[PDB]
Symmetry: C5
Subunit: 115 residues, 5 copies
């Protein structure tokens, strides 16, 4: 598996606009909400859950990176794998998207996998 | 168990106004006090205890998040579970609320269970 | 044991004015000096020593919190247990006080055990 | 092995312009892009993969330092080992360079091996 | 062993002006350069190596503290043990000094052994 796998999904020029920390089924988790820098579209929501899913090893790394990018409000590319979380109230509040990577962006290029 | 469970309680549009760190019964713990951003209402106090309660796994993440929101003074939704802590002097100093979640807010809308 | 035990000692309305990090007897440690925010009185000195004393579990949490309160210069209540460190040269340089808690203080109160 | 081994490659007077965090084959990884502070030349790209290669022990140290230098935009020397990473799409997206060191460069010569 | 042992050396009224991170012989390490705040004297260089020397246990604490004092520019007392590191190209790039302590300095005092 890789953040950049073609079967994952990514969204460019997003601003991390909200951040939530909680616990579910023995695991600390966090979720982020992102919106397009230009105000268009619908928000993207993605979560990472400690010790759950194949992405568990990167939980702390992604939490720390999401915190930083949230604090600056810079435009980023968010990478997700869809349809990972299944707890239904959790998905309804947040989403089933697993956060799998974050990339900084210049105005012309995001520094991370694409296509 | 989940932060968003109906059996928990939450308070929106709150600012973390005080922070305390200590140890009890070999466990580090911290407590926060929050107040409504507009100054109305009654303070909310909640604590997390590293080795105690079902919420023990989230101690470090909530400590780090509480510290961040404390440092910025931004408006948050604080999620607690009532009647968790039982040592009377501790409860009387702070409260029996376990801290179970923290959500950011933009204006009057917060990003978290409700 | 608890930060708030009556057999501990605390000092309110203090500012963390100095910070030292070192190692002793295989243990990283840190010490802080605090002084009254209003300039009166004599300093308080306390140390936390990584794998030493009953307070060892909270070493990292207290170091992180001391660094934060040091960086802001805000008024705090420092909680100590007296007569813990026994190495006389270490005590004479710093003190025998173990650091056991830190509480933010407003103009009117401190958020922690009294 | 050593960051400073002459078989490695380094670039002085750079700034960290981009940062990426992800996971591959159960390992956290990060990559950085650097460019000459003065705008000349071409970018340098390097990655660290937490579970992989002799450099694995320094993953967190390098990630933390990369984040700090990225946050400030200060001049740095970046040290890499060429021709390490193998997965073709990963290499094409980023590079085959392993990040093996970072040096501040706030004076005449960067503070690192040359 | 103790930071304050007379067999160590220290330098007051210094400011951390450079920081480097790397790895050698599977061990993460960092080095700092300090200069006198008033511009006099000769720079002090010291390194910590994560699993080498009797000072190995304090590696992370001193890296974190070095980073803190580097970022604030404040005047410090740096404590070293001389003649510890031995790899010649490393020693000639940096120095043989092990970093063993960091103490904040006001303007007439430093808070640490002397
Ligand atoms: C670039 C182009 O074809 N037309 C431009 C452009 O402004 C715009 O298209 C969108 O603009 C940028 C350019 O990359 C976006 O990056 C969109 O590409 C991606 C993305 O990286 O964000 C690709 C990605 O694979 C897509 N993810 C998924 C799951 O499908 C996303 C996603 O569709 C969008 O981010 C959702 O908003 O887009 C690119 O589509 C168009 C229309 O605005 O008009 C021209 O100006
Ligand atoms: C000061 C007071 O008593 N107010 C309530 C009144 O606000 C309440 O309905 C309110 O409806 C709005 C709709 O925008 C919000 O949903 C308020 O939500 C919460 C909150 O998010 O803060 C919900 C939460 O469940 C409540 N927490 C608990 C433990 O009950 C809090 C909480 O009451 C306040 O935060 C305390 O200051 O409010 C919601 O308050 C109606 C309900 O009868 O009338 C008043 O009682
Ligand atoms: C009085 C009663 O009815 N108790 C029952 C009993 O089944 C059980 O009591 C709790 O569970 C064990 C003992 O079985 C603990 O001794 C609880 O006491 C402490 C603890 O030792 O951990 C005291 C401690 O000071 C508290 N920590 C604080 C205040 O910071 C904790 C803390 O409140 C809890 O750990 C939170 O989960 O408890 C004792 O109260 C409980 C099982 O939950 O159920 C009662 O019906
Ligand atoms: C006009 C004026 O400033 N008068 C001060 C007077 O306020 C001050 O009294 C102190 O007021 C603070 C208020 O936060 C506390 O109530 C002090 O009580 C404690 C403390 O909390 O710090 C209680 C504590 O148990 C004591 N600790 C020990 C080991 O005994 C400490 C300790 O004695 C003092 O902190 C040392 O100064 O005090 C209360 O003393 C007094 C004393 O600072 O000085 C007037 O000028
Ligand atoms: C050399 C000098 O005193 N003054 C300028 C100078 O602007 C520039 O030369 C560069 O000067 C820097 C600052 O010390 C370095 O010395 C450059 O040498 C290195 C480097 O440290 O960056 C050595 C290194 O071994 C090289 N790495 C590899 C893999 O070969 C790099 C690399 O070639 C460059 O960084 C790529 O741009 O260079 C030194 O090049 C030149 C600019 O033309 O002009 C002098 O007058
Ligand atoms: C500091 C400078 O550049 N010039 C001198 C100054 O040396 C001299 O007195 C100095 O005053 C400072 C005040 O903090 C210290 O007391 C200096 O003592 C020490 C130190 O703590 O830095 C003692 C220490 O044991 C010495 N370390 C070693 C390995 O010998 C260091 C060391 O010699 C110096 O730091 C290196 O610069 O000095 C003390 O020397 C005053 C006269 O009082 O005049 C200045 O110009």
């Amino acid at each position: 598996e890789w953040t950049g796998d073609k079967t994952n999904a990514y969204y460019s020029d997003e601003v991390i606009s909200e951040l939530h920390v909680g616990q579910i089924d023995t695991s600390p988790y966090f979720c982020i909400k992102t919106v397009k820098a230009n105000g268009s579209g619908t928000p993207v929501v993605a979560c990472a859950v400690s010790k759950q899913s194949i992405w568990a090893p990167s939980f702390k790394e992604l939490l720390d990176q999401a915190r930083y990018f949230y604090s600056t409000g810079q435009s980023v590319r968010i990478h997700v794998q869809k349809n990972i979380w299944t707890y239904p109230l959790f998905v309804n509040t947040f989403s089933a998207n697993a956060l799998v990577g974050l990339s900084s962006c210049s105005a012309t290029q995001c520094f991370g996998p694409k296509l």
